[PDB]
Structure 1
């Protein structure tokens, strides 16, 4: 009984941890379509600087 209940909690926990890692990824500001353009030119934007 203990061994089967332990498998179910392990599977639920691994699924929970993978969900939280995906939600943190999908919340990255760089991936969001609604990112207002920066007013300042990025230092990596060599063409706009030139």
Structure 2
């Protein structure tokens, strides 16, 4: 009984960890919709600087 409950807890834990990882990824600011273009030209935008 102890081995069986142990397996169920592990499966739930692995699923829980994977979910947290995905949520963290989806909350990345660069992925989030059309923030109003930045008013300042990004240092990485070489064309606008030129």
| Shared fold, TM over 0.5 | yes
Aligned pair count reads 50
Unaligned runs of 5+ in 2: none
Alpha-carbon RMSD: 0.7
Q: Partner residue of 1:22? A: 22
Give me the TM-score of the superposition, normalised by structure 2.
0.93
Deviates more, 1:10-19 or 1:25-34: 25-34
Deviating 4+ runs (over 4 angstroms): none
Give me the TM-score of the superposition, normalised by structure 1.
0.93
Post-superposition offset of 1:34:
3.4
Query: Over residues 9-50 of structure 1, what are the superposed CA-to-partner deviations in whole Å (9 max), with x where a residue is unaligned?
Result: 000000001000000100101001132211110000000100
CA distance in 1, matches of 2:37, 2:44: 15
